[PDB]
Amino acid sequence: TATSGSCKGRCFELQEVGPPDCRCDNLCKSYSSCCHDFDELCLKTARGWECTKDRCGEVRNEENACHCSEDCLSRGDCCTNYQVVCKGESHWVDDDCEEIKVPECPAGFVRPPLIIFSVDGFRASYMKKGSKVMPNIEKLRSCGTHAPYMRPVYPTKTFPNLYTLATGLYPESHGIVGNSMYDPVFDASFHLRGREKFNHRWWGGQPLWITATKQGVRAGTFFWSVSIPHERRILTILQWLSLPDNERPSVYAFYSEQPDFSGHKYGPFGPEMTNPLREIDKTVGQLMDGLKQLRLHRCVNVIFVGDHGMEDVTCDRTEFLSNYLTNVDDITLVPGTLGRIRAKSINNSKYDPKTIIAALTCKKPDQHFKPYMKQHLPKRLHYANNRRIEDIHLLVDRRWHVARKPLDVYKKCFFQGDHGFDNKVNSMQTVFVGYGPTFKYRTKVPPFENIELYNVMCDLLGLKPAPNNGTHGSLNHLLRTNTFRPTMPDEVSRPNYPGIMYLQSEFDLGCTCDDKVENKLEELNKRLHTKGSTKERHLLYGRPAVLYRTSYDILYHTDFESGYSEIFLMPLWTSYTISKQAEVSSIPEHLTNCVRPDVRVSPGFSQNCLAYKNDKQMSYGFLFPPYLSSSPEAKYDAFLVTNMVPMYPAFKRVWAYFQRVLVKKYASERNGVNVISGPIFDYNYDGLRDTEDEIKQYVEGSSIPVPTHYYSIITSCLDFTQPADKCDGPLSVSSFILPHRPDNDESCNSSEDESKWVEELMKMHTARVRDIEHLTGLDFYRKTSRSYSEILTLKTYLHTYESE
Template identity: 65%
Template sequence: ASMVSILRTHPWTLCQSLVGVSVCLVTLSDSLWVSSAGSCKGRCFELEEALPPGCRCDNLCKTYYSCCSDFDEHCLKTAGSFECSEDRCGETRNDDHACHCSEDCLARGDCCTNYKALCKGDTKWVDDECEEITGPECPAGFIRPPLIMLSVDGFRDSYMKKGKAVIPNMEKLRTCGTHAPYMRPVYPSKTFPNLYTLATGLYPESHGIVGNSMHDPVFDANFSLRGREKLNHRWWGGQPIWITAEKQGVKAGTFFWPWPYVYAVHSEQPDTFGHRLGPFSNELDNPLREIDNVIGQLMNGLKQMNLHRCVNVIVVGDHGMEEAHCERTEFLSTYPVNVDEINLIPGSLGRIRARDPKSTTCELHSTCKMPTQHFKPYLKQHLPKRLHYANNRRIEDVHLLMERKWHIAKRNPGRCGFFGDHGFDNKITSMRTIFLGYGPSFMFQTKVAEFESIELYNVMCDLLGLTPAPNNGTHGSLNDMLKAPPFTPTMPEEVTPPTSSDTSSATTYDLGCSCDNEVSGEVMRQLIYDPQSETTIDNATHLPFGRPAVLFQTTYSLLLHSDFISGYSQELSMPLWTSFTVPKQVVMPLPEPEPVIECVRADMRVALEHSQACTTYSQDTDGSYGFLYPPELAMSSESKYDASLITNTVPMYPAFKKVWRYLQGTLLKRYAEENNGINVVTGPIFDNNYDGHRDSTVKIKEYAGVSAPVPTHYYVVITNCQDVNQTAEACDGPLNVFSFLLPHRSDNDESCKSSDDESQWVEELLMLHTARVRDVEILTGLDMYRSTTLNYTQTLSLKTFLHTFESDT
């Protein structure tokens, strides 16, 4: 039996016990049946768990399919149905029924949810007009509006398009309350990782539930949906909402303890039928109707008890559903891999570890094997940073990121029984799920921007008056969905302001650099910085949204140029960030650009000990340098000179320069043309331990040794005005942003087309490594957008937005 049926059985009990102070969680799995011999008479919801082979009557027996055969009869009382019918109206009370239609049921608080509508002529909740609930209308004794969260497994966002004909109650929640066009799950888009993310606000790598199945090398134990090990608390990290509530004075409990203020109920539908039928089958309409009917029972029950203006309700999915079939399966046995030497967790993503625990390497590494293959193999530290799927020992070292609709397996199993699946890259459209919020605390008839599921924990804490535990969400980013958000986010204080560069006592020195047209120190001084020059730097042009703030202790200075500005780190001898604005080009014949000269010059504003040396680059056979501000964009002789300064360079592998040059020389110009100009902020990232956070300066130097530190990634943040009639620097309204976190690797094997022209593969690679601005900020220790026309909640919403580059169809 599913949690849908349990909710169906007890919607009235659910609503009746809302005045209390404990927290209730209900979860569901697909564990194996054990035994049904014995009886639950006198044993309902016993606290002691009966051991196999005996049958069980505790609140988890449904989870393990091990209830006694009469559990439903005695404990769930299913004999009398869950709704009133015309012939039940005015019935004689029967205590064996789950709910009642007798004349005394209202006084006793145990009517079936449709009693007043069917037996007393009231209207159903779904038939009432939308009404704006101006404030909680709760019975005496309520401290705060309770919260009910119903998660529906595998509810793809496109199912909402079925509308009133199939899901009228959900459609009313969407229309009358607050909704998002979709909610993005975390990766992997599987049930257990996502349910626990909803409960904690943490990524799977942070809370530890990295899959429905996993191996812990320290515990030397396996976790699965069908095993008892999943009940061991050692697997579950972070602080779920019910523990947060308990720690802050709200009693915690389980399903059978009364008086909760928050209910979390999970239905395994429509996921089961989505797997069996695929997401586009018309036969899915029936399970969707059943789910909607349960939601209707809930809302009717709340209305019947006059709680429909008191309780906050969230309906949310854990992930979407994609078409999949065993005919679209890659078999590792067809690759040059000894499948007998590996353990593979197969399916919509592949996780590989060596079968021999003493082995520290695996033959399958991040290299293309076949041009037509339908997966990308990665070492986990090379996975797109937006996935946040590396920093946990339970995540295997080798990961196969599957193409949508495709599976991975060791060998052909010779059988097939599915037409849908999930677990794929969480940015693809088919993995999107739903968010609906309704009640006195939610905005009326409001559509908010799409968001990721890590953000809901903070919202639930706000609804319950709790202080959130540390989590991966950005508190306040969803304030626009609440009428009176209790938390007001504030801009973080800058830790390290920049120092100004001083050229008054600068002298020239030899860094082993050579360029044509070298100039004297005096001319250099004039070219680099002349405050009286007509080209004095305009911060409004190159820093239109404010200077990035540095949120860690360091030493850096501002280096001003006619076409770009840099925050230059003395400790790293390279910029922390470089910002410049690329205008839309005037439509007119342009002269042929001069060839870019690959050379660099010393920068007299930076002391010798804080500068990279050209000799370092020339002596490193594996390394080279690249420019943060692209010389290709320089239109004046002064700008060309600025672009060639060594303070505009960063260490860069020759292979990566193919990606970087195409981005700078081709794509930035196109983006500027399409968006009426763009602002670009770019720089290096150091995350050698792949924990998703900026490495400390000490750690960076440890990893670098005696060599110059080499970034693990480069970031690019591109912003334009949402109103394309306004330029980026003059924008006085909403902003658009997309960002890239590009892995800095010594090869381009991630792309099977890397031997082709860059136009055939680079942009696809960039889109795969799309990221949120918040991801960039956490990896750099910077804070961006400190001077905009947006309020701070809108700024946080912008920072947490992910441009997926996926079609909405």
């Protein structure tokens, strides 16, 4: 750097000048590249940050941090409280809240500006528990639009979540997969400290500032240097807002290190936390009083958002890998609130993942972490499809840490708070408030995920979002105006509707059934069932649409409808309705091993029983459960070869319990349920439906592909006084994506009765409908009475199974 130039007139300039000139933008600090006079000119502190009676109409003194002189409003650099002190105006927080029906902006303003006010470690329950000391924030919240909480992404760390906020992408896709990383292809290490985290090759996707800039919208800085005080960040934003129309940004960001910084030291609700909350609130008050001075307080959209929460964590709640492994010096642990394990040395081919996992599995009765291969993590975490994510992962229980060895924890108790846990954990939830002309007035919306906000911020700014993991339209209910008008994806493949085309003897599948048992009243009756007479009952929301090119058949049955894939030789989906009144029966003894050819579907597009017999690892289950047949006669339908799917014995324990006990429990509790079940194939763990040439496992000696997962979507009436099959209004859904594993090693209590571990597994693997859509290429809920935006909201819902 040639730091011999000057910042005279360039303080916090918006486009950084190119070396070897010296820099006066607000990253210069972080690159050792500021001009000599940067602090003197750009970081004035004289006389502090508030006008007092005695400074009112003072003579402009340019050494002052901010001004109380008569010309300050026009120069854009008054103290934020100037009008209050010197002109008898009220602080914004003292004014009543008044609906902002239209943007009330100064002339020259082409669009309401957006200000993102992000707060580090701002746990969701602060909104209620700290309400008495955060009057500015509470006004934004009750007068604007707010959720009870906002769900972060995993891991629930700072950089992964702020870059998710800026890109609408999962960390696996944007690349910032933790607060430290190693990247083998670069051979390189990213960390919180140091210079490496500033190289742009870490940062994938297209962040909002780049989306804005490419489309003609100017942006303020998103990164603030740690040595620029909050008061100066606010004044800088308010100065930028007084720039001329051609130079003025439309989007801005402010970031606070608090309350995170204190939360680490004192825990989430430590007595020391009251003051940081007060201070953030005061900052908010400064921004709003500043906006109001500039007549922007009914023009700008403000988003108050957190990156993650904070939990009680102490040194004594640390699990040490040295207590599990003998070989603890052959590994590298990325430690703390998650674990990632790789080999110390890439030249040691005597590193075995399998033995490391087994040595960490169910080894202590109260073990506070669970090892996973990353592809076996819950699909809701979307945490696998990146080379920077180690194959071995430890999911750590809330309130705990994991470390390699004790020396790592004392030759580094300091801390009483931390974060980074599973993003379903209550203590990790954070906040969202939207306030402004474009947000709704005094509106509460349901909790949603921070991946959705990029689309909305783009809407707010009139930008076309780059491709992202949001579901555009799912947050339209936040907005007064600027709604995105989404439409349903076009169906790509039309189904076939086969009739009876094959005689029994044409099949040689090696199946038997005990079913030679032969009436005219109920001969027309069953024909009606195979043409789809009951389909209105079992298919409540329309048939799912297939969004890729393939060959499939719709099959109707008395108790269930299916979309049967000629390519994968099993249903893509199976739909059935179980009313509150329905009865569970058993599989009669004579029908235990019964599998029946489907005369609507050719031998060449059918599974066969001989493959399952020959495959010593692999067994089979059914998508529509025999246990819920409406009649002895209807039960034969459930044993069609077209309803069969490959299942490991270990997995049949889970599936049988779900189908025999849980479906009926849910129907009783929810007043009927509609169930859609099916297979998922994600051998490359990218969260996306595999093509057939990606399948790595088949049922031995066959073309029957083995699913990696099985899903179910379980829908009912949100008003549970109406039965699922006659619901007039909004729906309620829960879903899961269970991993199809040949062991139950994941469940430490799996030697017990299914009543003690199965449901807990299923909860862990709760999913959004949207997650199943990505994994299957299906589009659900195509025919309802609800608006499409409401259905998009429903498809993004996750049932978390946390308490309140």
